[PDB]
Amino acid sequence: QGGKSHAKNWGPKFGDGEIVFPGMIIMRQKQGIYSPGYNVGRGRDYTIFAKTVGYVEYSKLKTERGKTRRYIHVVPINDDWSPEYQKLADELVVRRAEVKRQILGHHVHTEPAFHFSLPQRNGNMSWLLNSVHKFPGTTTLA
Amino acid sequence: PLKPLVFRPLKLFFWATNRHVHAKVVRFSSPFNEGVPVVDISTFDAFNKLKGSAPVVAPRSLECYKEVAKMVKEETARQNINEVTLHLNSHASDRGVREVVRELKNLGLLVKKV
Amino acid sequence: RLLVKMVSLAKTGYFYVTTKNPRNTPWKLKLMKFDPVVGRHVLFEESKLK
RNA sequence: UAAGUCAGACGCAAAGCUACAAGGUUUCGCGUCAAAAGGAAAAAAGUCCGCCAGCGAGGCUAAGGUACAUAAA
RNA sequence: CCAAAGGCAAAGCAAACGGCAGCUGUAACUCUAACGGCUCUAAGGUAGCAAAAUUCCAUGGCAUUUAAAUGAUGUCCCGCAUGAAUGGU
RNA sequence: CCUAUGCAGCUUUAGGGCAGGUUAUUAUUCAAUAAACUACCUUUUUUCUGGGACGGACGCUCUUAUUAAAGAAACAAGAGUGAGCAAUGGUUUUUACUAAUUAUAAAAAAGAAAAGCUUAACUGCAAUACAAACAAUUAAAGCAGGGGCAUUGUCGGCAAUAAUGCAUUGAAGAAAUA
RNA sequence: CGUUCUUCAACCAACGGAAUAAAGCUACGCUAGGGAUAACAGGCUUAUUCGCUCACAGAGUUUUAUCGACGAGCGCGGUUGGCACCUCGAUGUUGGAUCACCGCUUCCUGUAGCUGCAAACGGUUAUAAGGGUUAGACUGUUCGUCUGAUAAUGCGGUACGUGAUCUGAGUUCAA
RNA sequence: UAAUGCGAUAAUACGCAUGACGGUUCAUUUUUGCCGUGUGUGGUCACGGUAAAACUUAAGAAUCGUCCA
RNA sequence: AAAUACAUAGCUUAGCGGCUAAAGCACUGGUUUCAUAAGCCAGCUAUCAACAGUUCGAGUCUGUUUGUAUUUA
RNA sequence: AAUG
Numbered sequence A: 001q002g003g004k005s006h007a008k009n010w011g012p013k014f015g016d017g018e019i020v021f022p023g024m025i026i027m028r029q030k031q032g033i034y035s036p037g038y039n040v041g042r043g044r045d046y047t048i049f050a051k052t053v054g055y056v057e058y059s060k061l062k063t064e065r066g067k068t069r070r071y072i073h074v075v076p077i078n079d080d081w082s083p084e085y086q087k088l089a090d091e092l093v094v095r096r097a098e099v100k101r102q103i104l105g106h107h108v109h110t111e112p113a114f115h116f117s118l119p120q121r122n123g124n125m126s127w128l129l130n131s132v133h134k135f136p137g138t139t140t141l142a
Numbered sequence B: 001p002l003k004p005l006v007f008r009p010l011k012l013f014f015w016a017t018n019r020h021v022h023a024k025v026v027r028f029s030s031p032f033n034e035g036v037p038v039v040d041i042s043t044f045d046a047f048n049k050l051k052g053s054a055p056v057v058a059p060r061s062l063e064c065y066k067e068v069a070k071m072v073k074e075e076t077a078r079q080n081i082n083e084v085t086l087h088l089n090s091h092a093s094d095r096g097v098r099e100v101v102r103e104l105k106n107l108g109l110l111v112k113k114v
Numbered sequence C: 001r002l003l004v005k006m007v008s009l010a011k012t013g014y015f016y017v018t019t020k021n022p023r024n025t026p027w028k029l030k031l032m033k034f035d036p037v038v039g040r041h042v043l044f045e046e047s048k049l050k
Numbered sequence D: 001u002a003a004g005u006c007a008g009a010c011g012c013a014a015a016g017c018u019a020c021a022a023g024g025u026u027u028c029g030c031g032u033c034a035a036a037a038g039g040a041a042a043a044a045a046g047u048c049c050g051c052c053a054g055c056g057a058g059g060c061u062a063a064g065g066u067a068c069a070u071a072a073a
Numbered sequence E: 001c002c003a004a005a006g007g008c009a010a011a012g013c014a015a016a017c018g019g020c021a022g023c024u025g026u027a028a029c030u031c032u033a034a035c036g037g038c039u040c041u042a043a044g045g046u047a048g049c050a051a052a053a054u055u056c057c058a059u060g061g062c063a064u065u066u067a068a069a070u071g072a073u074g075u076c077c078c079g080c081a082u083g084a085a086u087g088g089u
Numbered sequence F: 001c002c003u004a005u006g007c008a009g010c011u012u013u014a015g016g017g018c019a020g021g022u023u024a025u026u027a028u029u030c031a032a033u034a035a036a037c038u039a040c041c042u043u044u045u046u047u048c049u050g051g052g053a054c055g056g057a058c059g060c061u062c063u064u065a066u067u068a069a070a071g072a073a074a075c076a077a078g079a080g081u082g083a084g085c086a087a088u089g090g091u092u093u094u095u096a097c098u099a100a101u102u103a104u105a106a107a108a109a110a111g112a113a114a115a116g117c118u119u120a121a122c123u124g125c126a127a128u129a130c131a132a133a134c135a136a137u138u139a140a141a142g143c144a145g146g147g148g149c150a151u152u153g154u155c156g157g158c159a160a161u162a163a164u165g166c167a168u169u170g171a172a173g174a175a176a177u178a
Numbered sequence G: 001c002g003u004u005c006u007u008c009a010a011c012c013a014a015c016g017g018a019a020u021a022a023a024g025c026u027a028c029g030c031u032a033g034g035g036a037u038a039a040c041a042g043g044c045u046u047a048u049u050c051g052c053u054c055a056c057a058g059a060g061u062u063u064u065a066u067c068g069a070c071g072a073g074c075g076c077g078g079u080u081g082g083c084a085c086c087u088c089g090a091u092g093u094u095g096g097a098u099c100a101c102c103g104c105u106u107c108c109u110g111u112a113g114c115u116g117c118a119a120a121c122g123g124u125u126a127u128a129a130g131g132g133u134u135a136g137a138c139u140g141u142u143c144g145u146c147u148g149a150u151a152a153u154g155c156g157g158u159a160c161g162u163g164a165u166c167u168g169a170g171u172u173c174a175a
Numbered sequence H: 001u002a003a004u005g006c007g008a009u010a011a012u013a014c015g016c017a018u019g020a021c022g023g024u025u026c027a028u029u030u031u032u033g034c035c036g037u038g039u040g041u042g043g044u045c046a047c048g049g050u051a052a053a054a055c056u057u058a059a060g061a062a063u064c065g066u067c068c069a
Numbered sequence I: 001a002a003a004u005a006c007a008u009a010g011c012u013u014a015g016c017g018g019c020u021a022a023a024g025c026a027c028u029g030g031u032u033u034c035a036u037a038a039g040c041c042a043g044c045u046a047u048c049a050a051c052a053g054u055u056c057g058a059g060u061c062u063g064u065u066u067g068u069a070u071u072u073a
Numbered sequence J: 001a002a003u004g
C-alpha cells in the first residue's frame, strides 16, 4: 500500500581546496561517474577515499573515443611529489590525534581500563576470551 | 574498473604514425607542470644510419626497430637511467612498438607497466 | 543449494562452512585451504554439515 | 535538563491525493498564534503596524487617517 | 441416504445430531417436451401444500367485494430460500 | 457509536490439566497409572484505518512529482525480490568483438569471449570516515603468517544499487580446567 | 560437571522477534472515558442537482409562433455526495392533529405585448404575492393510483416549523 | 602533426598531395525573452543565472566533391 | 463497484511447458434387412474466448479488453 | 426377431 526504501546519500563530501586526511570518504556514488586520480582509492561499490594528507581537486579529461572522464585528486601540502612526503604524512597523523584529545578533554576516555587484562594472540591484542582466567606471572615452572 | 593514477618521474611514450615510430623519455616534477624530454629517437634516425652501411627496406622494419631500441639504451645508460614506466595507450599495441619494447628489455633496461 | 562442512584431512578437527549445489556437482568437493592448527595449506574434503 | 513536550492551527507561496473543491487531507519554505497585552480594518486567536518593570494633564512617530458621528487640510 | 468428519453400538443406528444436483437435443404452423445424450454424488426432495406468520422483482395475473381497493376471500405456480414426528395436510 | 492494563455470563472439533463417574490395563484380600467419552477447573482470542466492521497491508531494493546540494509524507504512482554460480570466483596471454540485466547515458588500459594454471569464496589484527535515537548496517589504507597467477603487480568472492532475523534455548568439531 | 573458541538449526514473514501454547457470542449485559470519533440537526464546499445568458445547429418550413442541441460562462443552496468545525456530567425519530411567519421560480382570481390569434378553447413572454388553494376509497406512511365536485386544487424556507400543546400506526430494548 | 593524413592486394618502398571555388558538421555580457532568490495589494522593485531550454551576424577548423572559374 | 472460480471440433468431456491433442454422442461412407431402426466396419472435423508479454518453445505461466456463474454493498 |  505504501512503504519506502531507506535513503542513500549520493553525492560529493568536499569541494576544491578542502583539506583531507587518509581514509576520508570524498564521494558516494552508485556508478563510476567519477574516476580515481592521484593519491586516492576506490572501493568495490565505487566509494572514493583519500590516501594521503592534502587538498581535494577536480578535473575533466577528454578520451580517445570522444568520451568525457572526471577525476578526483588529492594534492600534497606544498606541491611536494617527492617520495619523502610519506614520512611527513605519518607524523601529521600522529599529531592530529593529539590535537583532538586535547580539545575533547580528559573525561572523554579513548582507551578502556578494566580490572583484568585482555588476552594476547599472535602478538596483538584480542577481544576474545580464553577458557580460563589467570593472573599473569603468578606461577612457576612445574 | 579503472585503476587510480600513480605519479612517476620518468615515463616512456610512443607515437606510431603511418611511416615511423617515435620514442621519448620525459621527466616530470609534478602533474601540473610541463616535462623535460631527455631522449628523442625515431625510426627516421635509424633509417638514415643503417641505410649508409647496411641496406634496409623501409623505416618500419625489424632492423630499424632493433636499432631504435639500441640507440635508446645508450642514451639512458649515459644519463644513468635504468628504470622507466611505460605509458599505455592505443599506439602502445602497435606491432612496431611491441618489437621495440621487447628489444629494450633484453638489452637491460627495466620497463614497468605498473 | 545446500550448506556443507569442509573438514581438514590432517585430522586436526578444523573445518570450513561453504555452499554447494549437489545436482551440478554430484561428488565430494575438495579444496586446498589454510589450517591454523598446522600453519600451512592442506587438503580439505566435503562432509555433511548436520 | 535522568525536566517538560511527542492531539497542533491559519496566512502568503509550491507539489501529491480530491473535482487545478472544502475552515479537507499529506509533505515542504517563511511568518504569526499557541505562550502576546497595545494601535488600524465594525465585532476581529493565525491578516497589517508593533513586543507591556512602575507612575506623570510633557514631546516625536508607525500602520492607517485629515467636512458629521470622530482627533487632524 | 450411515459415504467423509464425529458420537454411540452386537462391525450396526436417521421418530439419534444431519443431507436430499447440473448441462443438452427433440411432436404437422408455432410453442412446449411425452421421449433421448452426458457429467457427478452417500443420496440427489416423493406425496401434499404453495404469492404463505415463508416471495428480493411486487402494489405478480384473473374473478368477487366499493362511486373509487398497496385491503379481504377464491384461483393460477420449481417455491430468491416449501416439504413430511425440529412432522405434512 | 468508538476507545480500555477492562469486567462478567454463555458456546465450541481454540491451548493446557485430571480432581467425580464410565471405560481400559495391572496389583492386594474402599487400590495405582491414563493422548478416550461425559462433568469440572484454568488460560488465549494484534495493530494500522479520512469512525468501526468487510477488504487490503506490514521485511528489503530500483524509478516518478515536490527542479539542477542532501533530506522529505499519504490505504499516492510505476516495476522487482525472500536467489543463482565449483565457475558466472582469483590471476596471466591473444583480438576482424563492445553486449546484457527487474530497471538504468557505468566502464577502452576497461569489459566480454577463447586458451592455460589455480582456491584469497583465507588465519590473527587495523588508522580514518560515511551514516545513524540506540541496536545493528556501509567503505577501508596498512601490519604479520600461509598461499595463487604473474615476475614485482594484483587476489580478504561475484560491474554497482535487493536475495534477510537480536537475545534466549538446543546441537556439532576442537581445546583448557576440575 | 563446568568454561572458551570454530559453527549451525527451529518458531519468530504481526519480519526490534519473547507471559511456552492457544477461537467465538451478548438484543440479558455492567464499569471507566471521548464530541480527540460515527448515526439526526446546524456549519464549510458545490462535483452532482436546479436555474439563467451566450450559442440558432437541427425540427417546424419564409419567420427565434412553438419545440430544441453540441459547447462555454455565471448564479442558487431545496437533490445525491465530501469533510469531521459545535454538542456524548443527554441538541427527544418518521408522518399527522392544532396554530403559524416569510420568499416568488404564479395553480386560480389581475395588467400589457406576440402568435401558425376569425369566434370559443389555447400557446408563449414581461409584470403582479391582497384573497383563495376541495370532500372521500387503498396505504403507518412523505409519495403514489383512483372516484364525485371545483375559479383553481402552486412550489419552497422556517432544528427537512411546531411532543415543558396532543397523538405513537412505522422505525429503534427485554417475549 | 609533411617523420602528417587517407588508400579498393592495404602491408606502406608505391598511389593521391599544403592553393582555389561549392556544399555539409562544428561581438558594447550579439540582445531580447525566459528562469531563480528576496521583497511584495497578487509587480511603475532589486540582484544574479541560462557551459540547462527559444533567439543574430560572422570568421575560422575538420572531412567531402572538383582538369579550376 | 469489491471477492472467488470458468471460457476447450457440431455438443458433453482429456490436457495445465518438449511440438498443437485423448474418450464418448453427432456427421459421412460401407455391411446386415423386402425396407426402416438396433448391431458391426472404416473415416472426418489445422480441436484449444481475444490482445499484449515471459521463455530456446506456452492450450498450459503473468496482465488488459470482453462474456458466465458465486459471495458481498 | 422393435416397426410397417
Ligand SMILES: [K+]
Binding pocket: E086
Ligand atoms: K428432533
Ligand SMILES: [K+]
Binding pocket: F050, G084
Ligand atoms: K470522514
Ligand SMILES: [K+]
Binding pocket: G014
Ligand atoms: K509486531
Ligand SMILES: [K+]
Binding pocket: G087, G088
Ligand atoms: K451527543
Ligand SMILES: [K+]
Binding pocket: G106
Ligand atoms: K398569476
Ligand SMILES: [Mg+2]
Binding pocket: none
Ligand atoms: Mg509488498
Ligand SMILES: [Mg+2]
Binding pocket: none
Ligand atoms: Mg572463519
Ligand SMILES: [Mg+2]
Binding pocket: D006
Ligand atoms: Mg504518540
Ligand SMILES: [Mg+2]
Binding pocket: none
Ligand atoms: Mg502526533
Ligand SMILES: [Mg+2]
Binding pocket: none
Ligand atoms: Mg486543516
Ligand SMILES: [Mg+2]
Binding pocket: none
Ligand atoms: Mg496547549
Ligand SMILES: [Mg+2]
Binding pocket: none
Ligand atoms: Mg506630529
Ligand SMILES: [Mg+2]
Binding pocket: none
Ligand atoms: Mg474634529
Ligand SMILES: [Mg+2]
Binding pocket: none
Ligand atoms: Mg421447518
Ligand SMILES: [Mg+2]
Binding pocket: none
Ligand atoms: Mg405442530
Ligand SMILES: [Mg+2]
Binding pocket: none
Ligand atoms: Mg483498531
